UniProtKB/Swiss-Prot annotation, chain B:
The lineage of its organism: Eukaryota, Metazoa, Chordata, Craniata, Vertebrata. This is Tyrosine-protein phosphatase non-receptor type 11. The chain holds residues 248 to 525 of 593 of the full protein. Changing L14F: In NS1; increases MAPK signaling; increases protein tyrosine phosphatase activity; changed substrate selectivity for GAB1. Changing Y32C: In NS1 and LPRD1; does not affect subcellular location; decreases protein tyrosine phosphatase activity against CDC73. Acts downstream of various receptor and cytoplasmic protein tyrosine kinases to participate in the signal transduction from the cell surface to the nucleus. Positively regulates MAPK signal transduction pathway. Dephosphorylates GAB1, ARHGAP35 and EGFR. Dephosphorylates ROCK2 at 'Tyr-722' resulting in stimulation of its RhoA binding activity. Dephosphorylates CDC73. Dephosphorylates SOX9 on tyrosine residues, leading to inactivate SOX9 and promote ossification. Dephosphorylates tyrosine-phosphorylated NEDD9/CAS-L. It is linked to LEOPARD syndrome 1: A disorder characterized by lentigines, electrocardiographic conduction abnormalities, ocular hypertelorism, pulmonic stenosis, abnormalities of genitalia, retardation of growth, and sensorineural deafness. Residues 1-262 form the Tyrosine-protein phosphatase domain. The gene is PTPN11. The SH2 domains repress phosphatase activity. Binding of these domains to phosphotyrosine-containing proteins relieves this auto-inhibition, possibly by inducing a conformational change in the enzyme. It comes from the Eukaryota. It is found in: Cytoplasm; Nucleus. It comes from Homo sapiens.
Amino acid sequence: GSVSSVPTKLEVVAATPTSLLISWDAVDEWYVSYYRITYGETVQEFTVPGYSSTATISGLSYTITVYAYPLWSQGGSPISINY
Amino acid sequence: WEEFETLQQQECKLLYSRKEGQRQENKNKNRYKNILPFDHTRVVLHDGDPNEPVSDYINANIIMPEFPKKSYIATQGCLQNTVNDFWRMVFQENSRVIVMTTKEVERGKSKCVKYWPDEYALKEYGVMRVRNVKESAAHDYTLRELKLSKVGQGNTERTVWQYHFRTWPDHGVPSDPGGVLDFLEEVHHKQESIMDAGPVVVHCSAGIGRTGTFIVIDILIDIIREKGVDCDIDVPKTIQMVRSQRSGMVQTEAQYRFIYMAVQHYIETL
């Protein structure tokens, strides 16, 4: 059996003091119906189509976590970052 | 509601093996490496080309309702190298109805590779011979009447009706379920009218998302058709039951809500 981390990277590419442009890599040949982005103060949630590799978060005065669905055959925990 | 997330968390570990799809000799037969058929419900193909090390594999699962005419085949969209395998599967199961859930290309991405000849044309896929005798067009779908038979065996020809759904939006689900319901009513009229008809094939792209929505809606609508309003419509239980035969049927929350909306539209129509 094999197990893959989806996504593999999570990067804050651009930022305003209230917005945040987040980005992640996409595993080729890996099906992702959608992504769930959770953000909070080191929570709030939203979802985003599997086609996308970028997202924007507004309404901020921070931990960001990316889940990929379906959930099986994954490393065991999602990718996360602090900003 | 929040039950869809509970089902998604329930599918974070799969309880049945998918080893045949993970073999090296099958690595080029799957659109995605994480969408694989269960071993105990996968379709086993006969009469493959012996030059290939493995010729009995296709990313396809038999889906049965449980609390061939009333069963389905859920499979991925064809790849360029798996079209002959798709037609071998359609012939081997005596299937008479195919439901395409996506267009050939949508938003630039190839979802379903063309595996049929044009109207009044004829093409051979391996040992299978497919003839397109008539194409009709409705608002929500395109019907193509095909003739499938084995080469050198004219007494094996049967009609396969391919219902290609084309109205599904690029993002999200249809805002109204009337088109899907009329489409499935036509498919049900076609399948019921053929004696000893095999499983209805439902496929395109990954073959779990829109495919799962279609299959689950059809199952629940048939329950309502058979017993009326005095029956139990358990959407999460039906999703769990179909997921025990193919992983991840129905993928988004919008499709989850669309199942409820279509079932209630059908109930209010009766």
